[PDB]
Amino acid sequence: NQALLRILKETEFKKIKVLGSGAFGTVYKGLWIPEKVKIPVAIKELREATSPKANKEILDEAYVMASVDNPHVCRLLGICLTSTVQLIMQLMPFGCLLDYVREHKDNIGSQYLLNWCVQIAKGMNYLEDRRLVHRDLAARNVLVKTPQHVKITDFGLAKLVPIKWMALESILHRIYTHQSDVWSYGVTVWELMTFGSKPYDGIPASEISSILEKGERLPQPPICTIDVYMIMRKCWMIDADSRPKFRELIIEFSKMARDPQRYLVIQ
Numbered sequence: 001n002q003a004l005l006r007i008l009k010e011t012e013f014k015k016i017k018v019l020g021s022g023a024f025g026t027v028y029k030g031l032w033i034p035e036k037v038k039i040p041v042a043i044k045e046l047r048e049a050t051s052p053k054a055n056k057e058i059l060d061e062a063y064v065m066a067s068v069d070n071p072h073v074c075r076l077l078g079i080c081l082t083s084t085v086q087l088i089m090q091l092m093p094f095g096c097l098l099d100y101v102r103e104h105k106d107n108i109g110s111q112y113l114l115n116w117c118v119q120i121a122k123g124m125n126y127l128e129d130r131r132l133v134h135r136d137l138a139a140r141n142v143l144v145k146t147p148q149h150v151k152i153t154d155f156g157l158a159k160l161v162p163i164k165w166m167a168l169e170s171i172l173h174r175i176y177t178h179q180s181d182v183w184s185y186g187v188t189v190w191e192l193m194t195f196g197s198k199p200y201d202g203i204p205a206s207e208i209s210s211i212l213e214k215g216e217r218l219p220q221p222p223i224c225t226i227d228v229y230m231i232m233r234k235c236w237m238i239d240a241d242s243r244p245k246f247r248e249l250i251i252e253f254s255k256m257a258r259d260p261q262r263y264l265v266i267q
């Protein structure tokens with residue numbers, strides 16, 4: 001447990017380039033130099049002094065993030081606690097899956113798409129087995145190591161509001177469970193099947209709850225056969241217990257991945 005998370009000194013890593021920024025902070029492409037080696041790594045520097053969280057509480061959450069052991073979930077490699085929290089992770093050179101599918105839309109076939117739905121469902125099922133709720137699953141929070149190998153990221157970062165990815169019960173009661181992660185998974189699948197479309201495009205965040213109450217859901221992507229769409233639709237049921245479990249999401253999308261042209265119709 002304790003040895004799974006490395007406490008990095010400031011001299012062990014060097015920020016080289018910027019990869020992205022937001023309210024959370026900044027991510028850098030970096031070099032980890034512990035030993036005559038140089039490891040390409042990504043370094044997320046969180047915004048300083050957002051909350052009064054103590055160092056012991058931070059490392060306790062980082063230990064959990066360093067303990068994940070699944071091919072489709074990102075693992076925290078190291079942490080550097082200074083004025084800011086700096087999280088060190090291996091570099092995913094193809095970026096987030098949302099930007100990937102938007103840039104490669106013309107060259108993405110049915111096997112790649114269903115293989116992604118399988119891998120995301122496997123990573124989420126592992127998080128649920130670890131009794132961990134993600135709370136922020138979206139195509140922007142899936143990283144691409146190689147085109148056929150993706151990993152879920154940004155779990156547990158909430159500890160220390162994406163309305164359009166949240167289940168109705170999370171919007172109305174701030175309830176977050178593994179079945180509310182299933183809702184976000186269905187939206188994530190919708191993002192992939194539309195090659196990176198924005199869900200409820202133009203609709204303001206304050207109107208999403210009434211849209212869902214009216215029974216409106218994200219429209220069937222053109223390439224999705226009715227089989228794929230009803231699985232996505234089942235993820236968006238009001239009754240969280242009636243939504244699919246991640247375990248059975250792995251099964252059906254695995255079955256569909258055996259014959260992808262039967263379930264996705266791509267030009």
Ligand SMILES: *CCC(=O)Nc1cccc(-c2c[nH]c3ncnc(Nc4ccc5c(cnn5Cc5ccccc5)c4)c23)c1
Nearest residue numbers: 019020027042044074075076087091092095096140154155
């Ligand atoms: C979809 C648009 C987008 O997100 N672009 C983007 C922005 C910032 C960084 C990256 C990016 C590109 N390649 C990457 N490789 C590896 N990591 C990141 N970003 C990233 C995400 C999350 C993260 C870190 C570092 N620490 N965390 C949090 C974390 C890590 C492990 C486990 C749990 C939580 C870097 C990359 C793309």
